[PDB]
Design an enzyme around this catalytic site. Structure first.
Site, PDB file in Angstrom:
ATOM      1  N   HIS A   1      82.526   3.580  21.849  1.00 54.13           N
ATOM      2  CA  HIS A   1      82.904   4.796  22.556  1.00 54.13           C
ATOM      3  C   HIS A   1      81.842   5.887  22.389  1.00 54.13           C
ATOM      4  O   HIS A   1      81.923   6.933  23.029  1.00 54.13           O
ATOM      5  CB  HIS A   1      84.322   5.245  22.174  1.00 54.13           C
ATOM      6  CG  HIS A   1      84.496   5.788  20.780  1.00 54.13           C
ATOM      7  ND1 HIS A   1      83.805   6.880  20.289  1.00 54.13           N
ATOM      8  CD2 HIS A   1      85.329   5.397  19.794  1.00 54.13           C
ATOM      9  CE1 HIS A   1      84.223   7.131  19.052  1.00 54.13           C
ATOM     10  NE2 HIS A   1      85.138   6.237  18.727  1.00 54.13           N
TER      11      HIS A   1
ATOM     12  N   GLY B   1      83.954  12.946  13.579  1.00 54.31           N
ATOM     13  CA  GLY B   1      82.669  12.361  13.231  1.00 54.31           C
ATOM     14  C   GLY B   1      82.771  11.262  12.182  1.00 54.31           C
ATOM     15  O   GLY B   1      81.759  10.716  11.760  1.00 54.31           O
TER      16      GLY B   1
ATOM     17  N   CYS C   1      84.101   8.430  12.676  1.00 47.98           N
ATOM     18  CA  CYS C   1      84.067   7.137  13.341  1.00 47.98           C
ATOM     19  C   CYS C   1      82.801   6.371  12.948  1.00 47.98           C
ATOM     20  O   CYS C   1      81.724   6.955  12.785  1.00 47.98           O
ATOM     21  CB  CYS C   1      84.113   7.273  14.862  1.00 47.98           C
ATOM     22  SG  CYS C   1      85.462   8.334  15.440  1.00 47.98           S
TER      23      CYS C   1
END
Ligand SMILES: [K+]
Lengths: 306, 306
Positions: B41, B143, B145
């Site tokens: 993503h 952030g 991820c």
């Protein structure tokens, strides 16, 4: 979102852990530069431990009595000294993985990460508080001694604890890295009572602030209180007195949430008196006191390292 | 000896964390050999996220669209592929600090350590369970991820989780390192409901075993039960069914303590029905379910790593 007992990353400390053996006793040591630090009780036999004269036991030891193993590498001991209750073994090799570090003496209530080790090898990492009675409620087994507690600032490891002993109550005691015990304890097998353990009030408040940030607001109440009125109720529930210094440190969190410290104090007052009514805060049914104000900021703001 | 939420040492994983940037998004990537793994993503803009066609968005991307930084070292991307929901960026350099590793898909209930990272840099490490509803109750911020979950066996890191998203409920969802989401989730900004969460029964039992090992025996009762009779009571309190596989994995702990699994089950039955009467087990007023049988063995036996 979310909130956890979050430890510092252990990488920098992992690379400093060695195995130290003397007689039949094996524990852990901390290898920084060409020095390995470990508890001096490693030189004692079971019978020595009942009333050890360390000055004398150490004079009778030679460098070759100490076996230090770093991974599958034997480190040769080429010197030994004693600083308070820590043994310093000078070795033939500076640790190539020595990080930037300081030795720090922490205050009761302050928290740190523990890298629990056996045989110089890490088993796990967990977050800890120095209890008000100068014990720590660790998870340590036989051979854990020499395991260290630390904080990290940027890239600098601040070593604050070395594990020396378990007490009959199953809680733990140790030294700063200068070998000075936290609390009234000694490295002797003699009855030693922990002072009464109290709850770290400032930390409970910090954790309530954390709870607000993460949604939970049910414990917020319409009451307020003066500092002294609060402390009167606290003392009755075995809570540490809340100082002005504590109020000041909670300032950032009070600003973040907009809830004043004394208002949060009132919310705690009620929680102490009435209880939680089967409700939970941040997934806990007990008031958690092993998070400092700074620890909340770090986890809720996302502070990183190196 | 005590008992803590104890995480694996993070050292081996610290050395694999990099920063990955694409378009308007910076998150974390995992650098193993000459490949960096991160959530796909990262290639989406805000608008793309509402209904992303990933095959098409990626065809439109070139290697130069991806900026990977390991500390103050730029890694040059020389290839890109997609495996399910993970993006694999081939880089010009194998990670010198690549550990022994596997990619493992864990089952609900199983636990892992999380190294929460921002901008390729570690913030902290904490222990986690894959909830029965395939969410995890992490501590993650914007952030986070690309942050990973892992277990260690000896010297081999078994990567089991990569963080992709926070859900409205404040819980977290992600993939194995093959890019397959745990649970019914998708990397699209479209409303997604967690299934109802249940309590991890096998883990509560494991933790009761831990309690016995550490002294607490008050919850032990004279009663026994059949597996089915237990599960009938469990289901009523939102507990996962206990399987025979679960009983078998509790074997080591049953042997260590000498208490049979079904006997411990009976002790739990009572605890569920009557409650704790304001008593606590291992410092907790709630039945803790984020410790596997293996986690208890490791903490209570002193299993180390490398
Ligand atoms: K209030």
């Amino acid at each position: 979102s979310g909130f956890r007992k979050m430890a510092f990353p252990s990488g920098k400390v992992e690379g400093c852990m060695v195995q130290v053996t003397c007689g039949t006793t094996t524990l852990n040591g901390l290898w920084l530069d060409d020095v390995v630090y470990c508890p001096r009780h490693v030189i004692c036999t079971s019978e020595d431990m009942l009333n050890p004269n360390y000055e004398d036991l150490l004079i009778r030891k030679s460098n070759h009595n100490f076996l230090v193993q770093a991974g599958n590498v034997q480190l040769r001991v080429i010197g030994h000294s004693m600083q308070n209750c820590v043994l310093k073994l000078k070795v033939d090799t500076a640790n190539p993985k020595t990080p930037k570090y300081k030795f720090v003496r922490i205050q009761p209530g302050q928290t740190f990460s523990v890298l629990a080790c056996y045989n110089g090898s890490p088993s796990g990492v967990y977050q800890c508080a120095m209890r008000p009675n100068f014990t720590i409620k660790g998870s340590f087994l036989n051979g854990s001694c020499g395991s260290v507690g630390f904080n990290i600032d940027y890239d600098c490891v601040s070593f604050c604890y070395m594990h020396h002993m378990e007490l009959p109550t199953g809680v733990h005691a140790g030294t700063d890295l200068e070998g000075n015990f936290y609390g009234p304890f000694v490295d002797r097998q003699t009855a030693q009572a922990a002072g009464t353990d109290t709850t770290i009030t400032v930390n409970v408040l910090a954790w309530l602030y954390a709870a607000v940030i993460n949604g939970d607001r049910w414990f917020l109440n319409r009451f307020t209180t003066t500092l002294n009125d609060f402390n009167l109720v606290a003392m009755k529930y075995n809570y540490e007195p809340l100082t002005q210094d504590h109020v000041d440190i909670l300032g950032p969190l009070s600003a973040q949430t907009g809830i004043a410290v004394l208002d949060m104090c009132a919310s705690l007052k009620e929680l102490l008196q009435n209880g939680m009514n089967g409700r939970t805060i941040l997934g806990s049914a007990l008031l958690e006191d092993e998070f400092t104000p700074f620890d909340v900021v770090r986890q809720c703001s996302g502070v990183t390292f190196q």
